[PDB]
Design a binder for this molecule. Structure first.
Ligand code: MG
Ligand code: MG
Ligand code: MG
Ligand code: MG
Ligand code: MG
Ligand code: MG
Ligand code: MG
Ligand code: MG
Ligand code: MG
Ligand code: MG
Ligand code: MG
Ligand code: MG
Lengths: 207, 95, 147
RNA sequence: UUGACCUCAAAUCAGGUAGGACUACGCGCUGAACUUAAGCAUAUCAAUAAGCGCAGGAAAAGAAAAUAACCAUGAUUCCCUCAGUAACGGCGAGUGAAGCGGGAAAAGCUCAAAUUUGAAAUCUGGCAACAUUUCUUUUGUUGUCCGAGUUGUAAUUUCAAGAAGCUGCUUUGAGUGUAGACGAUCGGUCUAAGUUCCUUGGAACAGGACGUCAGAGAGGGUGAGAACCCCGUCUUUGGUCGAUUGGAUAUGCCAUAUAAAGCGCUUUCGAAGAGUCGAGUUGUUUGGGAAUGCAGCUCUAAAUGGGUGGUAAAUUUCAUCUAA
RNA sequence: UGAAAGUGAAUGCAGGUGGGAACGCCCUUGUGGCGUGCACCAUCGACCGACCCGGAAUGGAAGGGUUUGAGU
RNA sequence: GUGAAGAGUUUCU
């Protein structure tokens, strides 16, 4: 029974847990298998990059919206503005995300720049060898499998190292502004319901 | 849009832009062909028995009773108010 | 390892340390922590007061990301900046003042514990305590709020 | 009277097909109690054992009627984290997920709703010919006739759109054998070296002396501990076969290639799944709390409608998705 | 810290008092006196949160409190 | 489900 010092025990071992114990003795084996699959895939799709180029997007929620990460695929607007048809995008390793949209010019411009850099570094082989066509390249001899992250890395946003302190900043009251702004949002509804009572119940005064 | 994390128009200020039309959001619109088909079907099929009962209460100016019956028949009040307005238009369409 | 265990020492001692009178029976006061209100009360009330009962409101579907707000005090503010930035501004007279973006160091609110050196600095933060803002302003610096 | 059509039969009719087994893993149904709660009924054991149906090399899931509430994200699955947390619980014993974040892997699509209506443009079967083959064992092509099909088979479209019209733009799939190599492999071997002497012993594979090879001193065999006795071990090419336009000038050549896609302004448009959604109620289930999922029964929709937004309700906004 | 919305840690040498390790200095041979005072404990305050006050639409600044917290 | 009388725009015997 309980008589020792420490936390009251919590162990969730009342089912037949030994029946479903998962061990990891295959962890180095799985690691070797996965590396061999990557090597097999790389040799098969060569000289195409092993990884497709991805957009840069901002993660949701206030915990991560200060960061930048790879997204699933480029938006239809982003492909349009970079001069790439959506049916052609997949044929040259550009993923298409029909779900994501560009709510701001910054997201659009950032990813349009990624596509433009990709296209400028891209060597499209002609469909028929030795008969170059529009949109292709005529110097395919120096083609090799290269990492997209070596050419188009995901870059985090930089900072202002230093700047002058203006008189406007010196007069700014940060704490009071935070308290006022929170109070203003908090009592917006009461203010709106008050405004109805301020201008509607007074209408009987006319007649 | 102060650029703070509190207040009415909180959040970082970026360059806003117009999102393109998503055709999936067109759902719920009434196409002219579908409206024509439904008018024909309403001619062939009549009214459901509860619809006749609701219209009768509407024609006798028992507005609360019609609302109680339509909500009781359809479930929610929101569907009832839409149905009573539709049946009210029918009643006035005949007048 | 087993060679150094007390079990090895009890070989030849009949009761294995569990007594001849009371023994080492199966669960003689029940299993787990059962009985905190009845026969284990003198333990629960002495070492885990507050265990039984309810306190406070429920909150359905809590999501902790909108609540995220780790804090940093004033005495750590200058430690967030690189060594080269400290040497350039800390203690000097410059036309520009360094910017310390506390959010990119992983903090959502600047709190007021400790003291600041007497150099101007611009503190970019989502939130700041009142006393933290007063001490930043006394050092000649400012707080600029961000999202 | 016959014939047509419809519906319904029969045949050892012509050709097919299902069952049984394997159950580690997989998808469901049904479903305990021991046990824990120091008794015990809710609870727990457990959405477990037993029982029943059904698969594959994986299965299931899957291109949002999804998140969120952000500067937003972006099918599914799995791992780490979230987290023994929010929550459930004779709030007792006990139980207990999810969004974000990091990582593995990544891939996207098909229908139904449209008048081809200056042409059912679609499909199966029989018969015949002609090809083809892991293969006389396989797999098709054409012709013809008969059936199917307008109670709708094709074609453009699937909301991410798109279609019809106004106006401007470039142009592509298949056989032969080389080198580079590559799957089954091989007449399978160029692949190295002590079986000398002395002692003990039934036997030398032991000890000693003298040598050797080593990209080989892994292992096994042989009359006792053998790198050099035997098989092997290590190292490294040349004979085939087949996938052989997979890559190269893939040359040398087949002759695919004459009419189908890309963006581009303007319009008017833009069909979008019903006893289903939703509501009540009963049972069950869940961490899901005035119902999380499932199921019965009652009621039963709509067209900017409808779903979701984790506290019941009425109203008003906003966001996001687009079910059956 | 608070159930929560929230708010969030220096009057001062990061305080005072008592004991105190180690060190230094004076005696004069004692279990000495003097000065700093680590750790730790007891203790008087200060500071942050909750709570209870008066208290000159929204905010709670200065002033307080026998209290309260797994704080500084 | 389909029809007839009766009861102070209806559903009860
Ligand atoms: Mg005994
Ligand atoms: Mg006894
Ligand atoms: Mg019991
Ligand atoms: Mg017992
Ligand atoms: Mg019993
Ligand atoms: Mg079973
Ligand atoms: Mg099989
Ligand atoms: Mg499958
Ligand atoms: Mg879709
Ligand atoms: Mg359970
Ligand atoms: Mg649909
Ligand atoms: Mg059941």
């Amino acid at each position: 029974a309980i008589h020792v010092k420490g936390q009251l025990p919590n162990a969730h071992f009342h089912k037949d847990w030994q029946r479903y114990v998962k061990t990891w003795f295959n962890q180095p084996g799985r690691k070797l298998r996965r590396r061999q699959a990557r090597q097999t895939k790389a040799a098969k799709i060569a000289p195409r990059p092993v990884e497709a180029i991805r957009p840069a997007v901002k993660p949701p929620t206030i915990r991560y919206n200060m960061k930048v990460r790879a997204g699933r695929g480029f938006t239809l607007e982003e492909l349009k503005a970079a001069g790439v048809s959506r049916r052609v995008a997949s044929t040259i390793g550009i993923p298409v995300d029909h779900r994501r949209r560009n709510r701001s010019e910054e997201s659009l411009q950032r990813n349009v720049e990624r596509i433009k850099v990709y296209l400028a570094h891209l060597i499209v082989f002609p469909r028929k060898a030795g008969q170059p066509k529009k949109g292709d390249a005529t110097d395919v001899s120096g083609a090799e499998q290269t990492d997209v992250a070596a050419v188009l890395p995901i870059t985090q946003e930089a900072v202002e190292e230093a700047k002058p302190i203006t008189e406007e900043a010196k007069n700014f009251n940060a704490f009071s502004t935070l308290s006022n702004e929170r109070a203003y949002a908090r009592y917006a509804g009461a203010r709106a319901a008050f405004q109805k009572k301020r201008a509607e119940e007074a209408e009987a005064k006319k007649k | 849009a102060p650029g703070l994390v509190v207040g009415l128009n909180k959040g970082k200020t970026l360059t806003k832009r117009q999102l393109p039309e998503r055709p999936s959001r067109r759902k719920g619109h009434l196409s002219k062909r579908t409206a024509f088909v439904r008018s024909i079907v309403r001619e062939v099929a009549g009214f459901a028995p509860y619809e006749r009962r609701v219209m009768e209460l509407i024609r006798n100016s028992q507005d609360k009773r019609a609302r109680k019956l339509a909500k009781k028949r359809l479930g929610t009040l929101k569907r009832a108010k839409g149905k009573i307005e539709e049946l009210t238009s029918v009643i006035q369409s005949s007048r | 390892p087993t060679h150094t265990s007390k079990t090895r020492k009890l070989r030849g001692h009949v009761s294995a340390g569990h007594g001849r009178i009371g023994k080492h029976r199966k669960h003689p006061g029940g299993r787990g922590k059962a009985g905190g209100l009845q026969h284990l009360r003198s333990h629960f009330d002495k070492y885990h007061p507050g265990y039984f009962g309810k306190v406070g409101m429920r909150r359905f579907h809590l999501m902790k990301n909108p609540l995220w707000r780790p804090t940093v005090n004033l005495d750590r503010l200058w430690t967030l900046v690189p060594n080269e930035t400290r040497e350039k501004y800390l203690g000097k007279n410059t036309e520009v003042a360094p910017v310390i973006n506390v959010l990119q160091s992983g903090y959502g609110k600047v709190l007021g514990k400790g003291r600041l050196p007497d150099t101007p600095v611009i503190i970019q933060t989502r939130y700041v305590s009142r006393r933290a803002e007063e001490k930043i302003k006394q050092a000649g610096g400012v707080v600029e709020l961000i999202a």
